[PDB]
Paper text:
BPSL1038 is a protein with 88 amino acids encoded by a gene annotated as hypothetical in B. pseudomallei. The overall structure folded into a modified βαββαβα ferredoxin fold similar to known Cas2 nucleases. An active site with a unique D11(X20)SST motif was identified and proposed for BPSL1038 and its orthologs.
In the absence of a characterized homolog for BPSL1038 in the Protein Data Bank (PDB), the structure of BPSL1038 was determined via experimental phasing using the SAD method with the Se-Met substituted protein crystals diffracting to 1.88 Å resolution. The SeMet-BPSL1038 (smBPSL0138) and native BPSL1038 (rBPSL1038) crystals diffracted to 1.88 Å and 1.55 Å resolution, respectively. Both crystals belong to space group C2221 with similar unit cells. The crystal structure revealed that the asymmetric unit comprises of two molecules of BPSL1038 that form a homodimeric structure.
Numbering used by the authors:
A (entry chain A): -13 to 87
B (entry chain B): 2 to 87
Write the structure that this text describes.
């Protein structure tokens, strides 16, 4: 079973807010430093994209990030309602089912 | 339509971007490894399509999005999101 999907459901330890944060390549390392502050509630999907399970209004996260990295920084924050994904890595798959619900 | 965010690993960036071209003005590239797509497509169908063309061991994530907030230097992304997202 390498194909998976989740409706990112709030119930139990899965918070209601499901966010996808994307930056530009040039800011990858700075966004990662910042995302690590959210602990086990985020995971890095690529050098420039993260998933965050947290009850935070997107515009508020945006103001927070711009205050730290600078107001001329490019970023995109989406509220997600589902995820469909594929991985070949057994270790990444268990992290992800847990993080996604 | 539906609002999708597609993310791959850095190793696959060139292959994904070639493939995302078929969606024309309905997609915009946000970074090397992330795209926004405005299209009426089932996410598992998009996923099966991608895996058939890039390889079945490829890592990918497809999110259905219900809102976006952004600040950007990329004129194509600003225009595509502000016009198509809703
Ligand atoms: Na939220
Ligand atoms: Na096809």
């Amino acid at each position: 079973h390498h194909h998976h999907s989740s409706g990112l459901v709030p119930r139990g330890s899965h918070m209601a807010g499901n966010l996808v944060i994307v930056c530009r390549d040039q800011d990858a390392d700075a966004f990662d430093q910042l995302m690590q502050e959210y602990g086990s509630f985020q995971t890095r999907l690529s050098s420039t994209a993260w998933y965050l399970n947290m009850n935070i209004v997107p515009e508020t996260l945006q103001e927070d990030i711009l205050e730290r990295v600078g107001k001329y920084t490019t970023l995109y924050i989406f509220e997600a309602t589902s995820v469909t994904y594929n991985t070949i890595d057994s270790n990444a798959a268990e992290t992800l089912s847990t993080l996604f619900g």
